[PDB]
């Protein structure tokens, strides 16, 4: 019936003065834009159909044409920034916001989806959607006693659109908008649907990726314990955003890192640092490096949870990026830790993999490993055990690598290796 229409026939039907003909043509356009192929979005735009679809969005007496046009415009807005721009320039944002209050659930869902695509284009269209007043009706759609009474796909689409309203930086979302949305996000974070939980954790990760004031806004809602709980989840789509959010949070103040620790996050890191997914492993090692950059009591908390052996493990065997995050974590540990903690670190066997990692090509990892070794040698100097550390670094064939690095192209590596070999290996 409405399958495989030509854009010319679609235009013919839309330009008729027969609302039923227009509805048939609009459904034909929707189906044309719904194929698994890359839809013919450019052809639809060139025909000048966006304004007609936007007008059909306002026909409350013909809910089916509202639904078909909303679906078509959603698909159009799902494409390049230019096609989303074409949708927005047709005046579709206020029409979709008005349709958010439709009595029909599928029309409201399509409006939510379209607004989500528009906002996901970027921070400019996100802020424009917010300025047209979408947050209020969006959050009203979720003002129910129990989220379980909502359709699964409906709630998933609402959560995804809200996450896109929290997304993107330069600029970050308006502070008042973030504060208006956060409570609903916490509510959703206590939901049971894995996809809702994943999208909510991604929204929280977006909000926590910024200066310490954004982190503070997020942390004051008390979501850190729930984030740790989800960090212990089995489904990777949940663990990934939860770990990203925890990492963001620990990039802030020592008090925010302390909130992360008090929630019991470290107890989950034994598995995270041994996770089969290298991405989880790298994100966890980066979170650990940010934690070891904190206060001495926080380093001691890391020690008490038995995580130093896991840091040694990831330093010994892991993909190069994870090993680099581990080197950073060790350097922060040694720079901020007591000589007692550094001695413990050495006793766990850090020296051998730290040496092994000095044959790397990256000059940054080389210089950070040299900084770590320098901190370790200072700690040993305060103990009079510097000859012990020399014999340690020479037993595993490590001093050879420092001697080789003496001739590195980087001036900093050159000088650090020369200083180490001149003072501790002469």
């Amino acid at each position: 019936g409405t399958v495989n229409w030509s854009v010319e026939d679609i235009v013919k039907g839309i330009n008729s003065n027969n609302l039923e003909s227009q509805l048939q043509a609009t459904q034909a356009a929707r189906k044309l834009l719904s194929r698994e192929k890359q839809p013919p979005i450019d052809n639809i735009i060139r025909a000048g159909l966006i304004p007609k679809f936007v007008s059909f969005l306002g026909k409350t007496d013909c809910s089916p044409i509202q639904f078909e046009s909303a679906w078509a415009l959603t698909n159009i807005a799902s494409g390049t920034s230019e096609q989303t721009k074409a949708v927005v320039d047709g005046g579709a944002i206020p029409a979709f916001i008005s349709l958010l209050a439709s009595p029909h659930a599928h029309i409201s869902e399509q409006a939510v989806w379209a607004l989500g695509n528009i906002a996901g284009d970027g921070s400019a269209f996100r802020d424009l959607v917010i300025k047209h007043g979408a947050i209020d009706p969006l959050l009203a759609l979720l003002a129910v006693p129990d989220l379980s009474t909502l359709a699964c796909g409906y709630l998933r689409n609402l959560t995804w659109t809200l996450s896109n309203l929290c997304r993107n930086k330069n600029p970050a979302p308006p502070l008042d908008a973030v504060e208006q949305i956060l409570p609903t996000l916490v509510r959703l974070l206590h939901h049971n649907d894995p996809e809702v939980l994943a999208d909510s954790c991604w929204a929280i990760s977006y909000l926590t990726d910024g200066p310490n004031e954004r982190i503070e806004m997020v942390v004051k809602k008390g979501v850190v314990p729930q984030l740790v709980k989800l960090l212990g989840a089995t489904e990777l789509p949940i663990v990934t955003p939860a770990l990203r959010a925890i990492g963001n949070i620990v990039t802030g103040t020592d008090e925010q890192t302390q909130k992360v620790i008090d929630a019991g996050a470290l107890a989950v890191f034994p598995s995270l640092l041994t996770n089969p997914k290298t991405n989880i492993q790298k994100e966890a090692t980066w979170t650990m490096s940010n934690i070891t950059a904190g206060r001495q009591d926080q380093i001691q908390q890391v020690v008490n949870h038995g995580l130093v052996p896991f840091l040694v493990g990831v330093l010994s065997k892991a993909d190069f990026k994870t090993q680099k995050e581990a080197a950073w974590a060790i350097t922060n540990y040694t720079s901020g830790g007591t000589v007692e903690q550094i001695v413990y670190l050495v006793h766990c066997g850090i020296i051998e993999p730290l040496m092994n990692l000095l044959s790397a090509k990256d000059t940054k990892i080389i210089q950070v490993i040299l900084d770590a070794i320098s901190n370790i040698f200072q700690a040993a100097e305060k103990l009079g055990e510097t000859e012990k550390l020399s014999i340690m670094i020479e037993e595993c064939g490590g001093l050879d690598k420092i001697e080789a690095l003496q001739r590195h192209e980087n001036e900093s590596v050159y000088k650090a290796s020369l200083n180490l070999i001149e003072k501790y290996f002469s």
Binding site: N75, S78, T84
Partner: peptide, 16 residues
Amino acid sequence: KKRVLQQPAKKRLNFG
């Protein structure tokens, strides 16, 4: 000393 650093689809096409 603390160093810094998107899986969900930014846009989704409705297939059905």
